[PDB]
Design a protein around this ligand. Structure first.
Ligand SMILES: CN(C)c1ncc(Cl)c(Nc2ccc3c(c2)CC(=O)N3)n1
Ligand SMILES: CN(C)c1ncc(Cl)c(Nc2ccc3c(c2)CC(=O)N3)n1
Ligand SMILES: [Cl-]
Ligand SMILES: [Cl-]
Lengths: 123, 4, 123, 4
C-alpha cells in the first residue's frame, strides 16, 4: 500500500494499556498463582502468551473470569512476566532467572525463554 | 511519521 | 531499574491484537457510523483515542456494547482510523484526507490530526 | 533485546 506509519504508535498503545491495568480499568480476568491474584486484560495476555492464546480461544474457557495456574508456578516469576507483557521490560536478575525461564516456558513466551537460555549460558 |  | 527490553514487543502485541480483531475474537463493542458497523476491543479504542478513553471510563457508558457516532462522521474515514489504531499504518490519500482529519479531530487522535494538517499545508 |  501507500500508507504512512507512526513509529511510536505501538509503544504508546502499550503504555496506555499498562495505564488501564494499573487503574484496574476494563480488566476482565484474574490469574491465580498459588495464594496471589493478578488482574489483567485477556486480549493482552493472548497477544503475549501462547498458553493464554490457547486458553481464551477455547469456546468454554473464553468466558471464565478466573484462571488458576499450575501450583508449580512461582508468583514472583509470573509478576515479572506480566509486567514484561505490558511494558516490553524484563526484570531479569540472578535470583529470579530460573523462576522467570520456567514461567516463560509454561506461558509459551518464546522470546523471554530465548534471552533466559542465553543469560544462563553466559554464566 | 515514516514511509514503512 | 536494571531491566532489559525487547525492541519488537509492542509491535508484536499490536499485530496479535489486529489478528484477534480480524477473526472477531474477544471484541466487546460495535461502533455504528451511519449505516456501517465496526467491531473492536474497547481497550484498543481507549489506548488510541481521547474520545473513546472518555466514553469507556464513564461509569455508565463503560457497559454499553453499542456506540453510535455523530451522523456527520464518514464511515470510510472511521475505517481508515480504526485500521491505523490496530496497525500504526495510515492510508492517507488526496481523496480521503479531509474526512480522515475531521474524524481524527472528533476521535481526539492528536498525532493523526498533526500529519493531516502538515500534508494539507504542503498542497 | 537491548539496555533501554
Ligand atoms: C498464532 N496466531 C495466529 C496468533 N493470533 C493471535 C494471538 Cl493473540 C496470538 N498470540 C500468541 C500465540 C503464540 C505465542 C504468542 C502469542 C507469544 C509466543 O511466544 N507464542 N497468536
Ligand atoms: C491520559 N491518560 C492517563 C490515559 N490513560 C489511559 C488511556 Cl487508554 C488513555 N488514552 C488516550 C487519552 C487521550 C488521547 C489518546 C489516548 C490519544 C490522543 O491523541 N489523546 N489516556
Ligand atoms: Cl516473549
Ligand atoms: Cl494518534
Amino acid at each position: 500500500d501507500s500508507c504512512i506509519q507512526f513509529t511510536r504508535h505501538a509503544s504508546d498503545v502499550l503504555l496506555n494499556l499498562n495505564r488501564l491495568r494499573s487503574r484496574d480499568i476494563l480488566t476482565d480476568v484474574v490469574i491465580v498463582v498459588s495464594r496471589e491474584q493478578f488482574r489483567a486484560h485477556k486480549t493482552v495476555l493472548m497477544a503475549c502468551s501462547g498458553l493464554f492464546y490457547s486458553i481464551f480461544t477455547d469456546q468454554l474457557k473464553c468466558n471464565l473470569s478466573v484462571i488458576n495456574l499450575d501450583p508449580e508456578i512461582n508468583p514472583e516469576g509470573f509478576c515479572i512476566l506480566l509486567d514484561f507483557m505490558y511494558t516490553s521490560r524484563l526484570n531479569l536478575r540472578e535470583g529470579n532467572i530460573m523462576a522467570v525461564m520456567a514461567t516463560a516456558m509454561y506461558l509459551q513466551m518464546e522470546h523471554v525463554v530465548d534471552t533466559c537460555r542465553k543469560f544462563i549460558k553466559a554464566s | 511519521w515514516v514511509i514503512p
